Amino acid sequence: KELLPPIAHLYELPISKEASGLVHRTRQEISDLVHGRDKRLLVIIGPCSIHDPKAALEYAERLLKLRKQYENELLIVMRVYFEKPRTTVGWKGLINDPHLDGTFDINFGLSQARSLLLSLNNMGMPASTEFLDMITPQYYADLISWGAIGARTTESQVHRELASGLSCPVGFKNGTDGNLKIAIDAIGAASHSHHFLSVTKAGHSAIVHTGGNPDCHVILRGGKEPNYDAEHVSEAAEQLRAAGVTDKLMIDCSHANSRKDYTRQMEVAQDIAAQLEQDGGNIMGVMVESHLVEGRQDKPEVYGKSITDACIGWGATEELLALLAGANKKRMAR
Amino acid sequence: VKELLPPIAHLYELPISKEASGLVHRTRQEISDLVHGRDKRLLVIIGPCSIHDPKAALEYAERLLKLRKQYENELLIVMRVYFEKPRTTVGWKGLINDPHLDGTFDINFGLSQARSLLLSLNNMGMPASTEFLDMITPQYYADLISWGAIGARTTESQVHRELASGLSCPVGFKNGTDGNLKIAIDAIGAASHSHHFLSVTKAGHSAIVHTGGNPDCHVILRGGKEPNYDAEHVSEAAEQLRAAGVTDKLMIDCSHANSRKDYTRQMEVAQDIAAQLEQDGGNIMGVMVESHLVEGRQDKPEVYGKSITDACIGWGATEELLALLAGANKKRMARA
Amino acid sequence: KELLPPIAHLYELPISKEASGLVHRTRQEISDLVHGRDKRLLVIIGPCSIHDPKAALEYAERLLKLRKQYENELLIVMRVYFEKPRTTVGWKGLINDPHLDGTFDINFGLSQARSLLLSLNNMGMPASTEFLDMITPQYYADLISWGAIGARTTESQVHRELASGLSCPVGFKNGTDGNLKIAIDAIGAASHSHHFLSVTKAGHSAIVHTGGNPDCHVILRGGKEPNYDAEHVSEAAEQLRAAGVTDKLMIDCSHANSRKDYTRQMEVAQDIAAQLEQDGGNIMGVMVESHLVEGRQDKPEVYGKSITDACIGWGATEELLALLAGANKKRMAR
Amino acid sequence: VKELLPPIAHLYELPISKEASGLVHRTRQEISDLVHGRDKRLLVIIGPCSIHDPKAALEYAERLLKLRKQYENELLIVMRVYFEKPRTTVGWKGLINDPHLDGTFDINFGLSQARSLLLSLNNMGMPASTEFLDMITPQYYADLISWGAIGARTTESQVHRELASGLSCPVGFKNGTDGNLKIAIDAIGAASHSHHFLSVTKAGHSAIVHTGGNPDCHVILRGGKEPNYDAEHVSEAAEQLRAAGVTDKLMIDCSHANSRKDYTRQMEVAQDIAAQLEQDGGNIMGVMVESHLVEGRQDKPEVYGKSITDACIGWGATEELLALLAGANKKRMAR
Ligand SMILES: [Mn+2]
Ligand SMILES: [Mn+2]
Ligand SMILES: [Mn+2]
Ligand SMILES: [Mn+2]
């Protein structure tokens, strides 16, 4: 029944020295990308949502080899998303409903999330997630190397407040109809200090005073129309410069950029590869929804197959990563 | 720097009176009736963009109470008592977050002052409305609120739909800042359902909460890239509302993007609404107006009764605007 | 550094159906002794203090064989004391300092105590302890079948309040100089309802309203002089009746009744044996300090040997239990 | 059924003033000076057995303040402001536990009232003392306390010795209800050391605390089966204290078992103490007296300024008793 406070989980599942070092390092490297110091491509890649730790670990084992192999061209970090914003109602992810049956066993959800994150980081795979809920971060944020604020929450002051106090770099998605300005505004908000109410590690509400997050950037995830091409990127960088914030940005191959057709993710990646070969100087990253098995399913019957947005399968993932590595290797050669 | 006192500290210093409790209960029911088309009085959510001075707020409430009473057969008047302001980037977030208006963020003081003003307003017979922006502050005052808003910038946010699903007052969801109505329709859907999520108890500890859903949600047309207040936008919205199986009674904001952020054009929007109410106006249950003692705005809190956030109409024009709506709705209610 | 609330421990170490039922039946069975509805003799027996779980489990397994053997004559419940009152300063028990080295790892101490109690009840051995601290009981009282309030705290209003809200029977010891009245007064006070501050399972202070504890009794543990003989028992019983409370009592064979000399416990047990054969109608229980190996030691060097008060070893334990079982079989047959 | 407000609720409504903090700091230091033989003024813990009416307590404090000033070179006068009462069995546990005196246990109001009264006392220039009975309540007002007692019924209790080890005021431990002095000497030992134990924070959450030990503890002679205030008893206690390596400055209660539970005998005891101070009295650092505006006791709070717990001397006898002790100690100090 009762909610265990973060300290209960931190006590049982303390961050290892390995996990700690991988997080600190990956955050700094990503920061270097955000601010143009390094020209590797951040690739945020993996399932739309985590519903099975076993499949997640297997996926991570395969992805780790590509992370190492392409480490001079790409900085691979896995999607380990525990919180899903629904259009109306639906399963909100492993934390809110881990047994996938409407039992809402949130204590078990948080434990499993933390434990998965700990295991990923211990094997050498850094993790990313969307920070949707205001209280759950205390349970796992120490294990996160990069955070997203979703299209649906980028304009929300309470999420900009949250981002302002997070220790990892944060990407803000443009709004669901394509509005980029709200994400530029969000970087501005989140880079400043805020005072607001939040929950401590002991589970009590408190006034927090944050320092601001210097490592925020935008993510182009499509709108009414896709926004991944060179023209959309150029216009975005112009707007970012006029706002006085970093003009290095991330492109989501999924969602409104593939128009909900997982087979178009490769096409968006190819367009990005062509940008990187021609110039692509404003691109610091890409996002990809990828799993062991392609497509999606309503019920969790098939192993390693998404129960939220459809993903590319492992084979296409190998091709997509090869494609970006080769292209960015050329960008970095200039 | 002081730790956060829990809701119980304030609830105990400032308990709700039987009178305030009765006003809130009754006003929420009356509003539910408007939202579901059972009564044809027009809800008018009117008053300052933000509260920054309780004294001016109380004087405003005294003048407004006279009109609330005068027009009570035509209009259901509820004061805007907004304590939480969503900024485009950065800026003063309202009385709770920064009550001394100087960047000292004395939230404990902000919370008691908000609760105390709300209790005084209800005790004088003036019900209160606010935008629920923050996730943890509502436990401190929600017992004193008769109608709530979820702002344009948060209607699409799952955590705000969650919050709404657990509120005991009717809730209006604004269309998005670029005009997207579908998100507010989706929000009614979400907020009408039960949710499980994390929240904070009255003792100040985090907990898992399980809400029952809010059956009294509606949309608010507040403009986008173009205004959306006219008969054609109302008609299109009503269609979409019916297609989604939710109430097709809606509220129209005369301010913000519908006035094009020009306080002098609220009356223009109100005239258009008045005309709709006289011709038909059957899908309109409410209106929103940004009004203060004195018109305009000011960067610093120098002038008494003048907004430090969005520019408002002043008292004289408020009288005219309200008389306009009362007269027009009298006609609508008289029609066979 | 931060104290985990009881709920953290109750979540990791939930009580089993078996342990739950054992605790429930044992409390019931013991209430029947307290109020004179059954004439079996409660025997609270085991180490002065628990300092090693392994030895506690070995002891328990031997004690279980005798609990079964003597179940028609004796109700055997193990001493599992985790909190020790010191005359001045010293080791306060396994909870306060579980590593025995002055590190005070109280979180570990509490989980270790809870886990031991869970294993004991799961093997069929009910447990008893002294409730000394106001905050720790919430972490394990669900696993306790009988509780003591010590000689040094029986007169304390806060301990009487505590006893008033526990769900197990509770014995109050006469005071360290031999005062019986403070224990009689304690039963009165603890049987009534109290309002006082206590800490919830979530770790927050609260006002609790107890219903009172109707299963309290006195324990004769000696004073300036021993108080175990039939003369002292008779005088205690008259005073008990005069206060309107149960005149069934428990006798400690240890502490000041043995003059702090562990061999003398058997002398006291023999004397009680004589009483149960003659009559002994006011006796409902005895307490005995017993370990695998006899004596004491300042350092935990020898396995199964006390580091607090000296205990009788297993050999003598067998003889003491045989003696009481045989004597009480005769009492019960009358 | 209200929930318990945490100490920060009351601290932010009733913050300690500069003047009150100053008086508390000074008084604790001054008493420490007595405990450790740097000053020879006599600490006098004097006032009602229990506080049950703030109006009467404030009137009493105003009278006592005049005397605190008059005798300040001889006596260090501190008011008894006892909020927590240990009962033999059942009964009214005090103003905190039951402030409306009717079994409604309105503990939030009780704590507020206690804190408010203590704040006003310190603000008028009168330092306050109390018995610390409960493990959770001290956080609400300990900052306003200049001297604390651990009662005879808890001096042997480990949880109370732990509490004492973390308090920032001097603490007196009473001998046992039957006359045992060893338990109080043992308690000073225990309380002088660092402890790790569970306690509650200002925010209302349980926590492990690590105390630094209380170097300012001393014993209180309060009688047992027989009274223990005379020179022979003082001398025997002093020897035992020196044998245990702890301060041999002690306090003598004129009330309770040393007066054989009879309020008219408190003067008898103070007379005896007065002669000890004139002859020698080098081990006596203080005394306790149960005093109110009007003498006696009463079961119902009918008469203003009259005890409803133990019987007290009235204001007239209080003036005489304090004159006595001041006169006698003036001579001790001059030797
Ligand atoms: Mn997705
Ligand atoms: Mn506004
Ligand atoms: Mn022992
Ligand atoms: Mn008294």
**Range of helix content of chain A:** 25-40%
Biggest interface pair, residues each?
A: A-B, 46 and 47 residues
Q: Say what oligomer this is.
A: homotetramer
Per DSSP E runs of 2 or more residues, the count of β-strands of chain A stands at 10
Give the domain tally of chain A: 1
- CATH class of chain A, named Alpha Beta
What proportion of the residues of chain A form beta strands (DSSP E)? 5-15%
The arrangement of helices and strands of chain A along the chain is: HHEHEHEHEHEHEEEHEHEH
Domain DAHP synthetase I/KDSA (chain B): 29-321
GO molecular function, one term (chain B): metal ion binding
Enzyme class (chain B): transferase
Pfam family, one (chain B): DAHP_synth_1
Short description:
Chain A is of the alpha/beta class and 334 residues long. Chain A has helices spanning 6-12, 17-34, 53-69, 106-122, 137-140, 157-164, 181-191, 230-242, 265-278, 314-333; strands at 41-46, 74-79, 127-130, 146-149, 170-173, 195-199, 205-209, 216-220, 249-252, 283-289. Chains in contact: A-B, A-C, B-D, C-D.
Topology diagram in text:
4 copies of one chain form a homotetramer.
Chain A: H1 6-12, H2 17-34, E1 41-46, H3 53-69, E2 74-79, H4 106-122, E3 127-130, H5 137-140, E4 146-149, H6 157-164, E5 170-173, H7 181-191, E6 195-199, E7 205-209, E8 216-220, H8 230-242, E9 249-252, H9 265-278, E10 283-289, H10 314-333
Parallel strand pairs in A: 1-2, 1-10, 2-3, 3-4, 4-5, 5-8, 8-9, 9-10
Antiparallel strand pairs in A: 6-7
The structure holds manganese (II) ion (4 copies).
One manganese (II) ion binds at residues 49, 256, 290, 309-310 of chain B.
